[PDB]
From Swiss-Prot, chains A, B:
Official protein name in the record: Queuine tRNA-ribosyltransferase
Gene name for this UniProt entry: tgt
Positions of region (RNA binding): 246-252, 270-274
Cofactor binding: number and manner: Binds 1 zinc ion per subunit.
Source organism (scientific name): Zymomonas mobilis subsp. mobilis (strain ATCC 31821 / ZM4 / CP4)
Record note on what altering residue 141 to A does: Abolishes catalytic activity
Length: 368, 368
């Protein structure tokens, strides 16, 4: 297999379906990436993640650099061996999380220093991702808070683009990395069209293997995110993957595919799983609700996951109410499976030229 | 398969190996029973429990009667369907737990009433076990606290024996239960030989499918428990299973088999698993200890479990230190697997007439 090859096998409007071939495996697109904080997809064995249909998972520069340490994981053989996932891993660069989780920060042109004292810069971020043995490396960016004035949004975007160039060069500098991994740039600009264009252009000029749409999962309502996607994704190179970071709910995902996005990540299925929220084709339910205490149906009536073929709502209800680990396990497995079944339905419907009808049908039921 | 058939296929000194055939399956003896509070073996899918080699698991009258409720589980189809375990289940009667976990109790000849207001009596305990669809029903007893004066120990034992007769008759009264399940009596008497004899005798006179040794897991040191086992187990009918309740550490188990016990249960492998204690043939280790942070070996060098073939100490160390659910999962799977491998080694060595040498060899290493 090649280092990186994105091929589009079918299209419908702005939506696309295909594959990314990399050395550790093939990624079917549009793709949902379970998130794996902190070298684990919470409450799932790797094999279980794979069984739900996941082709790739996300790891985080920020958390692993604090625990257990980037150099340590490198010493132990890389993230894949450490956690037992042998397929592609995309690592976020830390750009977001450093500002999100740190107890104290100092931002500067050089990078960000923080307490949880550490510095994170384009160079270090790319080095950490290297040490982890990431397959898809993210540029070190700044995720602009929402809302943002045009001035501050512009300043932030410009910095991110300078950091994008520094990320590129740091990646290319490391032969082993350049030859075996891929590098994705990250578009910023808040919700402003001219800034998103200048950002798209700076990224394309630098050149990346894929293009992420940053900053649209930090407060924007769906209508606003969709409006920004409407003009923003066509700015990106058509022949490269389009990754919407941090999105999202099943309906976010469907609308974003309708707008040209090929890759997604979100903690919602996992986190909300452990809190008792289960996704269904008729909308999300809270399994803790009293009305499920003697409900013998599965979580969802059509889901093929192992959880739905074996246990009832009533049981899972009991587990979560009891704070039992197996509840978290079952809820999470179901939710990730559901997300993967959604992606398959999306891929298949685009392949067959009936995606717009799928999206309409999905919405009708999900929102009923 | 018959309702109940215990056959002894080989012996060595007081130790025995064989099988219990029941309608839902065969139990290899000596047997370790993972404990399944509250309709779950914590952090394991049923299938995972089975894969470690478990033939039967323990459920608890006390906890399930409070949550989710005995009648409710009966409504939903019985404990086996509810939790997805289709093999034998032994249910404890509540005798122990009511006094152990309840917030307020009133003991009387009729039974125990408690707040966590509920009453538990021989009749209700047996009815609850029925409702759950238990395969091996335990008599409702009183687990005498340790230490105990001879007077109080005698009074407690006598009550337990009256309750044993009431348990027997309540069980026999329910045709469905009498025909498909088994009933085990429970010997009490504290550490006193004459009381253990009177108890053994009252139990044998009543007649049960198996005989448990109660009250030896509530403070007694090993030397004392072994001394009491030394005279107590020969008092029980030889041709019926001998169950030591609540025991124990791997070395407890080996010494108790040496004294004629065929069945064990304990929360140690599960609970201590989640707290970071892993069993090894060289003794238990605490995986949280700093010295495991870059240790690439498996939990144990010889263990065949899935955990030891796939993940390192270093990873599991990281998980538990991070309070990750997958740490609890992996630790628990390993620990139960280890317990089952111990039981297999015991069964095989008795079958081959080299159990006394196994026990000596085990102790030498484990205590090295
Ligand atoms: N919005 C949003 C984001 C979610 N994850 C992100 N990660 C990075 N590196 N940048 C981003 O803007 C975001
Ligand atoms: N010792 C001890 C025991 C552990 N579980 C028990 N369960 C019952 N019913 N009785 C017992 O004495 C004990
Ligand atoms: Zn499901
Ligand atoms: Zn193991």
């Amino acid at each position: 297999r090649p280092r990186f090859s994105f091929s589009i096998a079918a299209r419908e409007g702005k939506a696309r379906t295909g594959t990314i071939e990399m050395k550790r495996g093939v990624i079917r697109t549009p793709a949902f990436m379970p998130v794996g904080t902190a070298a684990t997809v919470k409450a799932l064995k790797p094999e279980t993640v794979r069984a739900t249909g996941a082709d790739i998972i996300l790891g985080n520069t920020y958390h692993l650099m604090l625990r257990p340490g980037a150099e340590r994981i490198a010493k132990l053989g890389g993230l894949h061996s450490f956690m037992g996932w042998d397929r592609p891993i995309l690592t976020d660069s830390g750009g977001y999380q450093v500002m999100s989780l740190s107890s104290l920060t100092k931002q500067s042109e050089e990078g960000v220093t923080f307490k949880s004292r550490h510095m994170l810069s384009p160079e270090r971020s790319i080095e950490i991702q290297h040490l982890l043995g990431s397959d898809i490396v993210m540029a070190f960016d700044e995720c602009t808070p929402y809302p943002a004035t045009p001035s501050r949004a512009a300043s932030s975007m410009e910095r991110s683009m300078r950091w994008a160039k520094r990320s590129r060069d740091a990646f290319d500098s490391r032969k082993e990395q350049a030859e075996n991994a891929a590098l994705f740039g990250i578009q910023q600009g808040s919700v402003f069209e001219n800034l998103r264009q200048q950002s798209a252009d700076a990224l394309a000029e630098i050149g990346f293997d894929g293009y992420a749409v940053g900053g649209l999962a930090v407060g924007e309502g769906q209508d606003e995110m969709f409006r920004v996607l409407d003009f923003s994704v066509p700015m990106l190179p058509d022949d490269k993957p389009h990754y919407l970071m941090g999105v999202g709910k099943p309906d976010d995902i469907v609308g974003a595919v309708e707008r040209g996005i090929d890759m997604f990540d979100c903690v919602l299925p996992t986190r909300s799983g452990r809190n008792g929220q289960a996704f269904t084709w008729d909308g999300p339910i809270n399994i803790r609700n009293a009305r499920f205490s003697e409900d013998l149906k599965p979580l969802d009536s059509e889901c093929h996951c192992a959880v739905c073929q074996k246990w009832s709502r009533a049981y899972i209800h009991h587990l979560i109410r009891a704070g039992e680990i197996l509840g978290a396990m079952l809820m999470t497995e179901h939710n990730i499976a559901f997300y993967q079944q959604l992606m398959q339905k999306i891929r298949d419907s685009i392949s067959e030229g009936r995606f717009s009808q799928f999206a309409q049908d999905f919405r009708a039921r999900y929102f009923a």
